[PDB]
Design a protein around this ligand. Structure first.
Ligand code: 07D
Ligand code: 07D
Ligand code: 07D
Ligand code: BPH
Ligand code: BPH
Ligand code: U10
Ligand code: U10
Ligand code: CRT
Ligand code: CRT
Ligand code: CRT
Ligand code: CRT
Ligand code: FE
Lengths: 45, 259, 44, 255, 274, 45, 45, 45, 44, 45, 44, 45, 44, 45, 44, 45
């Protein structure tokens, strides 16, 4: 109830899920854009 | 005035403000912080995208990194504004037609800025931030990829832009003509058909053989406006990725005689 | 909306966020074993 | 061989033809939406449902959609409610495309530019449920901008210089803020008041009286303006009737 | 065939010229004297366009082209095999457009509504005339009008815009582009708002002007109104066409140099000229 | 003679006159376009 | 606690979180756009 | 004969006239565009 | 549509269409005598 | 015979006429475009 | 409408479509005699 | 057989006919675009 | 809309679709005899 | 089977048919774009 | 939609989807027999 | 199970289906873009 007294539960859940998905997608894209951590091309270390 | 921002509006404004500040600071630094030179060359100033050798990664700040940061922040701001105009329509218990029409412009913006560079592997041919720089990007894009006049989806985008202008010149003129009969109360006419809507439909029927309704003319307008940017985005995506020379494509497909 | 509903929501939220963070920590540990992401003085 | 699908077909052409298919479907849908008012087509002479149509008539007319109103009533589109076949006019020729000639006074008979749609006998309502269009007496809160000239007290004149009366009230719109109608006290038969659309009235600028000129009808036509049942509210049907009567002046004023 | 509400409006009168002769309908089309003239000019021009296509090298619709006479001909009428056909088609098209506008005027008179629609079509007619008559006349030859072809008029547009180095730098052309983009944006916004008010979602009640104003006030900060939006859209489209006409009049009749080079005056201003 | 019972005489006459005038103009323009039958230019046979 | 009588806690928290997240994202991007501090494409010091 | 019970004679006649005229004009133009069947240029066989 | 009038229209239409088809056939015969439009194996 | 209790005979005839005319026009245009079956140009076999 | 009129229309439709298909088949036979449209292994 | 209670037979038949004609036209054009299956051009196999 | 009419329509539709599929299969067999459309290991 | 209480069977079938047809068309066009599985051109393995 | 209507629709839907999936599996097996789409270590 | 009191099950199912299909399509297109995992081309390792 500490933080759910104010914020709507459904809105908080939807916003958190969307933000987490967008952040994960951005981090994965950034990793794919690097030579070392691109697991698809798999260049040498 | 009574602008409702909310959480999504605050986010979008912060992101867009950061992007605008980055772009403006880069433009002012390009003239060595001269207000006089900034005023002199404001149109010619631009923030260019990174070169092709950097790929989709983070280029150095002085070599396109600022462009990448500003572009990402602007894209996030625009997407959050789309979310805002979706949520405002939902809150007012109204339809999301405005959000889904803005989605087409966002699609074109992403195709020009992010999606096509993602397909091509680098940000070299992305649109720089500047009036004359982006005009020159337009010119050089068309010149490099054959002739954009010969792009069929560019043809369609131009046709739908002319159609949007034509449809608004028809609709505004018609509503002003029937404004003395209560035609400006369009939703009231939709809910209870009146002599204004009847006379507008009859005028267009007697003119060109067929007519619309007070709601379906707005459907026509919405679809024309959306299809302009949608077909244009499709043409931008297909340019270079699958067709390297639009003039040669037109020659192959009979649009022009073979040189 | 009410006190009991808020208590249930907080309990389930705590459980779900703990599962999410545990899975994320496991994935990060696996990625670190595969290839660390902190370069040394000479690099990678 | 970059974008080639076959020897001659390629990806750009395939996407173009996909868009052509989608656009044909979209035109079908848009015409379907166009046919939500006034359809099916009736015969010009007999009035029976009959028209030259093809195999697309199955898809031509969509199922009636329901508009939910804040008053609890519903409006269906298409409603299939046709006007009466018989009207107070006679064709000049027996052909279907021949025009109609009014039998008597077209302005009163409501044919041609004087014709109006049989709208609901209910005034437009604001968000709060109160009638949208009321005289300024019933709405003390609203006022005319100080930068503009109050039409109240200004003489009403026609295109020939004949004075029809004086403005005694203004009818405003509470939903969309604007002036809709002018209440004019006729010079002839004192005490009789007629409604006057605002959109059909231009102010004559510097005339030392700013006479509210009505180019639609002449002075003698003001006595035949349709009346309204209530003194503080106007229904949609009466509204249309008044606007239609005023709009027919350009064609039937000199007749 | 008639609509459910057309018989009471299909009345006599309203013709500008011709009287009762042409006051009749053929199907949904109102004929009128100017409609008869429109059909005359349309048939003549279409037949001559097909004749030019037959005279041409290909029957492909994209490659069909009717070309104006050579610049060497000046303003003199050319032989029919050397641009005279283009001139005849041009003037027949002008007649067809004028007759269409006057037919719209007759329909407006019959229905007792305003003439805003023919007035707005007059701007399209004026743009076409400026492109095929006014600009070549002030330029000194009929050869500067665009050829009547699906692709060759686009090639004319490209060549004319590259004659001045870069047409993107034409100051009136920038304003025309701005107004053309704004007309599409405003059309999208207006259609979207009207459709969102009429269709507020399943299980919801139709909204009104209050909600329409409140939505755009809340989102962007301000609104225009119910008729202000239509007036703004009409003015935007007509201003885009007018500024396009102005840029085309400037490009070649008045200004013959490079539009990118025209912008040096901004960099030569006294408060920045270093 | 029943074609006049089918079509109004004045409207039919006006439409036929317009059609015939358009046809004559089109054929004359075609002849002018051709080289053999351009009587104004008068090219040799 | 005087500050929270003037500023609404919900609005203050929402604004502060947005600003902090945007600032952190910008700083991380700036670091990624530098040769020395790019951890995903690490080079020599 | 029942075909005229199904269709309006006047509309049928007008539509047939317009369609046949347009078709004949198109066929004549197509002939005029060919080398063999252009009777106005008279190319030899 | 009255049967008598429809049959009168048919009796006029049949004669008119037969005359039109006969004129077209005569014109086509003359055109074929002038230059046939069916090429042989070697063309024209 | 049961199909005409589904579809209006007049609308079926009009649709058939339009569809057949357009299809025949398209096929004739394709044949004219081809070299073997262009009877007007008469290319050799 | 009613099966009587429907069957009359079906009879007339069947006769007309049979005539149409016979004309089309005769035309196609003549076109095939002129130039067949099915190439062999080596083409035409 | 309940599919015909779910769907209007008339609408289903018109939609199916339009879909089949468009699909057949698309496949025919695809075959014409091929060298092997172009019966009009007749390229050797 | 009803049950008997739906069953009649289903019967006629099944017969018509069977005829259509038989004709299509016969045409496909003819086209396969002319030129098969499944390449081998070495192509055509 | 309660998914059919959740969703209208008619709309579900229409949308599913549209989605499946579009997916199949996309997959076929992708196969045509590839060289190994282009059955019309039949490139060697 | 009543429970019996939903159950009947579910039964017919299950039958149709299994027929569809069986046909698709047969087609994919034929395509695999023609040319497999899973490359080996050395490609195709 | 209270998450289904928070969210409409029909909307949740529709959104999940759309999101999952879009994600699967995106991942498949990414794999097609990559050289190692393009099963249609089969580049050797
Ligand atoms: C050599 C130059 C050349 C050339 C000869 C020629 C010809 C012509 N063309 Mg073309 N064109 C050329 C090149 C070319 N052409 C364009 C496009 C078009 C369009 C734009 C449509 C639109 O609404 O854009 C406009 C929409 C956009 C770009 C997207 C909307 C943007 C949004 C929502 C973002 C919101 C913004 C903010 C929050 C503010 C952020 C702040 C900061 C950055 C500081 C269109 C309809 C059109 C018109 C004409 C005509 C009429 C002609 C004539 C008469 O010659 N052309 C292409 C496209 O796909 O358009 C969709 C495209 O990208 C491209 C290129 C490179
Ligand atoms: C070495 C490089 C590498 C590598 C080879 C590789 C592969 C791939 N990765 Mg990645 N990844 C790598 C590294 C790595 N990766 C991640 C994670 C992930 C995630 C995050 C999911 C997410 O954002 O959910 C975010 C969603 C949440 C948290 C939803 C929770 C729900 C909430 C709040 C409330 C519920 C309300 C709603 C949903 C609203 C609607 C209502 C209803 C439906 C009822 C995940 C499932 C995932 C998938 C893949 C894919 C598709 C690929 C492909 C094809 O390449 N990756 C891990 C994580 O977060 O696990 C929880 C993590 O820590 C970590 C690391 C280190
Ligand atoms: C070097 C190449 C280049 C270049 C880099 C660049 C860039 C861009 N430009 Mg430009 N342009 C270039 C070339 C160039 N530019 C144009 C014109 C414009 C316009 C006018 C639009 C208008 O108002 O049309 C107004 C339209 C007319 C002419 C209306 C006439 C129509 C009539 C009476 C009705 C006809 C009716 C029938 C026949 C009947 C039909 C029957 C049935 C359907 C049954 C305009 C706003 C515009 C658009 C863009 C953009 C958005 C871009 C982008 C995306 O960069 N350009 C000028 C013009 O036409 O001005 C009147 C002109 O001639 C000219 C030139 C030479
Ligand atoms: C259908 C295609 C057409 C179209 C449609 C279209 N555009 C649209 C819409 C639609 C339907 C909208 O609903 C949306 C809109 O709101 O319109 C009014 C929009 C829109 N398209 C726009 C413009 C636009 N449209 C264009 C064209 C088109 N869009 C096409 C012609 C074009 C071009 C190039 O022709 C442009 C430039 C915008 C006006 C608007 C989208 C606004 C947006 O996304 O804004 C993002 C937010 C920001 C940049 C934030 C700025 C913040 C400021 C710096 C203020 C300060 C804030 C604060 C101080 C920050 C906090 C500071 C602290 C952190 C320290
Ligand atoms: C001025 C604001 C916009 C506008 C408004 C506008 N247009 C209008 C109207 C209005 C208000 C009408 O009322 C009227 C109408 O009824 O539309 C349905 C119309 C109209 N504008 C039209 C088209 C159109 N408008 C355009 C633009 C615009 N018109 C502006 C953007 C454009 C372009 C290029 O952007 C086009 C293509 C038509 C739909 C219609 C015109 C109807 C008409 O003129 O009918 C009479 C003529 C014919 C039926 C055929 C005449 C054929 C000629 C004999 C030959 C002409 C050949 C031509 C010169 C070249 C052709 C080849 C090209 C490829 C170059
Ligand atoms: C308030 O909301 C509003 C609505 O409403 C409620 C609306 O609806 C609309 C209107 C908008 C829409 C309906 C949406 C669609 C509009 C667009 C997308 C804009 C684009 C428009 C088009 C692409 C259509 C263009 C079509 C045209 C221009 C019509 C063409 C017409 C002709 C060529 C013929 C004109 C008719 C004449 C002159 C007479 C009739 C002719 C015939 C029937 C054929 C010939 C007849 C005969 C042979 C017999 C008679 C012959 C005579 C008299 C002799 C002539 C001699 C010769 C042979 C030449 C708006 C704006 C509105 O805001
Ligand atoms: C039934 O009817 C309906 C209504 O009614 C009930 C309506 O209402 C509307 C809604 C329509 C309108 C309210 C206006 C429609 C008219 C046009 C589109 C043409 C006029 C164009 C504009 C004025 C642009 C307006 C667009 C806005 C305000 C978008 C808002 C976006 C943000 C707040 C995000 C941040 C803003 C940014 C980044 C820029 C936004 C653009 C501008 C504010 C204008 C551009 C300004 C500059 C970049 C520099 C200029 C600076 C200014 C103006 C300040 C200094 C002063 C100067 C003069 C220079 C419709 C459609 C409708 O159907
Ligand atoms: C009312 O309730 C009833 C009674 C109905 C009961 C219902 C209960 C329900 C429905 C409970 C549901 C609970 C659930 C599903 C809870 C889910 C919780 C989760 C998944 C929580 C996760 C939270 C994650 C957080 C807060 C993460 C924050 C991380 C941040 C802000 C990191 C930012 C990083 C930055 C800026 C840096 C990025 C670096 C670069 C730029 C390099 O990366 C791209
Ligand atoms: C009602 O009240 C109760 C009782 C409830 C009590 C409430 C108490 C509260 C809420 C108290 C809160 C107090 C707080 C948070 C106070 C914070 C104060 C701060 C941080 C003040 C800071 C002020 C800073 C100022 C004024 C700085 C001015 C600097 C200027 C103008 C510098 C300009 C520099 C220029 C133009 C030069 C630039 C150089 C470059 C290089 C940038 O130029 C190109
Ligand atoms: C109620 O009626 C009363 C009592 C008054 C009696 C009146 C009766 C009357 C007047 C009856 C009239 C009957 C008539 C006139 C009947 C006519 C029937 C005809 C001619 C029917 C024709 C049917 C033809 C069909 C269905 C043909 C279909 C062909 C198709 C779909 C072929 C498509 C081809 C494709 C897709 C491929 C083309 C190849 C290319 C090369 C174009 O591909 C790119
Ligand atoms: C108070 O401070 C003031 C306001 C005075 C500062 C002044 C600011 C000024 C003057 C700002 C504006 C300047 C000008 C002249 C702006 C003009 C802008 C124009 C006309 C831009 C036109 C087109 C640009 C486009 C279409 C670019 C789109 C770019 C996109 C979508 C880029 C996206 C990039 C992404 C998603 C990057 C991804 C890579 C990441 C970061 C994820 O990893 C490397
Ligand atoms: Fe309506």
């Amino acid at each position: 109830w500490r933080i759910w007294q104010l914020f709507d539960p459904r809105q908080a859940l939807v916003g958190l899920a969307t933000f987490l998905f967008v952040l994960a997608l951005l981090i994965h894209f950034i990793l794919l854009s690097t030579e070392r951590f691109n697991w698809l091309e798999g260049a040498s270390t | 005035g009574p602008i409702y921002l909310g959480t999504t509006g605050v986010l979008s404004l912060v992101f867009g403000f950061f992007a605008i500040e980055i772009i403006g600071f880069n433009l002012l630094a390009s003239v060595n912080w001269s207000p006089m030179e900034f005023g002199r060359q404001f149109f010619w100033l631009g923030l260019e995208p990174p070169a092709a050798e950097y790929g989709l990664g983070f280029a150095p700040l002085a070599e396109g990194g600022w462009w990448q940061i500003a572009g990402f922040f602007l894209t996030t701001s625009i997407l959050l504004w789309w979310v805002r105009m979706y949520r405002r329509a939902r809150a007012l218990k109204m339809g999301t037609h405005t959000a889904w029409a803005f989605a087409s412009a966002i699609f074109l913006f992403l195709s020009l800025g992010f999606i096509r560079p993602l397909l091509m592997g680098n940000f070299s041919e992305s649109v720089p931030f500047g009036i004359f720089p982006h005009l020159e990007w337009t010119n050089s894009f068309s010149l490099n990829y054959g002739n954009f006049f010969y792009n069929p989806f560019h043809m369609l985008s131009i046709a739908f832009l002319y159609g949007s202008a034509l449809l608004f010149a028809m609709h505004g003129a018609t509503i002003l003509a029937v404004s003395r009969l209560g035609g400006d109360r369009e939703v009231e006419q939709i809910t209870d058909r009146g002599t204004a809507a009847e006379r507008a439909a009859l005028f267009w029927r007697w003119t060109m053989g067929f007519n619309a309704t007070m709601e379906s003319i707005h459907r026509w307008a919405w679809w024309f406006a959306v299809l302009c940017t949608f077909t244009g985005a499709i043409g931008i995506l297909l340019t270079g990725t699958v067709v390297d020379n639009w003039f040669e494509w037109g020659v192959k497909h009979g649009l022009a005689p073979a040189p | 909306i009410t006190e009991g509903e808020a208590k249930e929501f907080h309990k389930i939220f705590t459980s779900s966020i703990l599962v999410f963070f545990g899975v994320a920590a496991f994935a990060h540990l696996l990625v670190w074993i595969w290839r660390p992401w902190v370069p040394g003085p000479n690099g990678y | 061989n970059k974008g080639d699908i076959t020897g001659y077909m390629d990806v750009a052409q395939v996407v173009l033809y996909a868009f052509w298919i989608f656009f044909a479907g979209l035109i079908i849908y848009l015409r379907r939406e166009d046919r939500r008012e006034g359809y099916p087509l009736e015969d010009a002479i007999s009035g029976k449902i009959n028209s030259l149509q093809g195999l697309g008539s199955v898809f031509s007319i969509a199922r009636p959609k329901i508009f939910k109103l804040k008053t609890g009533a519903t409006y269906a589109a298409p409603n299939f409610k046709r006007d009466a076949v018989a009207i107070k006019a006679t064709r000049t020729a027996p052909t279907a495309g021949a025009p109609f000639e009014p039998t008597g006074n077209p302005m009163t008979d409501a044919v041609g530019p004087a014709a109006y749609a049989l709208r609901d006998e209910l005034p437009d309502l604001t968000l709060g449920g109160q009638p949208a269009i009321v005289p300024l007496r019933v709405a003390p809160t609203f006022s005319v901008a100080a930068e503009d000239t109050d039409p109240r007290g200004l003489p009403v004149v026609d295109r020939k210089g004949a004075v029809a009366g004086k403005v005694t009230d203004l009818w405003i719109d509470r939903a969309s803020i604007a002036i809709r109608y002018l209440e004019v006290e006729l010079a002839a038969t004192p005490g009789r008041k007629v409604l006057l659309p605002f959109a059909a009235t231009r102010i004559n600028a510097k005339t030392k009286s700013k006479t509210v000129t009505v180019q639609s009808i002449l002075a003698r036509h003001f006595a035949n303006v349709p009346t309204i049942a209530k003194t503080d509210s106007i229904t949609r049907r009466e509204e249309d009737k008044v606007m239609a009567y005023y709009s027919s002046g350009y064609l039937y004023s000199d007749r | 065939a008639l609509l459910s509400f057309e018989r009471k409006y299909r009345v006599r009168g309203g013709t500008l010229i011709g009287g009762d002769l042409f006051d009749f309908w053929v199907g949904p089309f109102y004929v009128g004297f100017f409609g008869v003239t429109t059909l005359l000019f349309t048939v003549l021009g279409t037949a001559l366009i097909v004749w030019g296509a037959a005279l041409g090298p290909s029957w492909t619709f994209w490659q069909i082209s009717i070309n104006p006479p050579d610049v060497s001909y000046g303003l003199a009428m050319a032989p029919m095999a050397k641009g005279g056909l283009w001139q005849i088609i041009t003037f027949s098209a002008i007649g067809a457009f004028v007759s269409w506008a006057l037919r719209e005027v007759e329909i407006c008179r019959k229905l007792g509504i305003g003439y805003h629609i023919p007035f707005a079509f007059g701007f399209a007619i004026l743009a076409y005339v400026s492109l095929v008559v006014i600009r070549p006349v002030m330029m000194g030859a009929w050869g500067y009008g665009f050829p009547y072809g699906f692709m060759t008029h686009l090639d004319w547009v490209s060549n004319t815009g590259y004659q001045y180095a870069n047409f993107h730098y034409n100051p009136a052309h920038m304003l025309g582009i701005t107004l053309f983009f704004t007309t599409c944006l405003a059309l999208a916004l207006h259609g979207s708002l009207i459709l969102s008010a009429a269709n507020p979602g399943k299980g919801e009640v139709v909204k009104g002007p209050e909600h329409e104003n409140t939505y755009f006030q809340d989102t962007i900060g301000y609104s225009v109104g119910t008729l202000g939006i239509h007036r703004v859209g009409l003015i935007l489209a007509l201003s885009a066409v007018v500024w396009s006409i102005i840029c085309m009049i400037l490009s070649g009749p008045i200004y013959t140099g490079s539009w990118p080079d025209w912008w040096l005056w901004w960099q030569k201003l006294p408060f920045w000229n270093h």
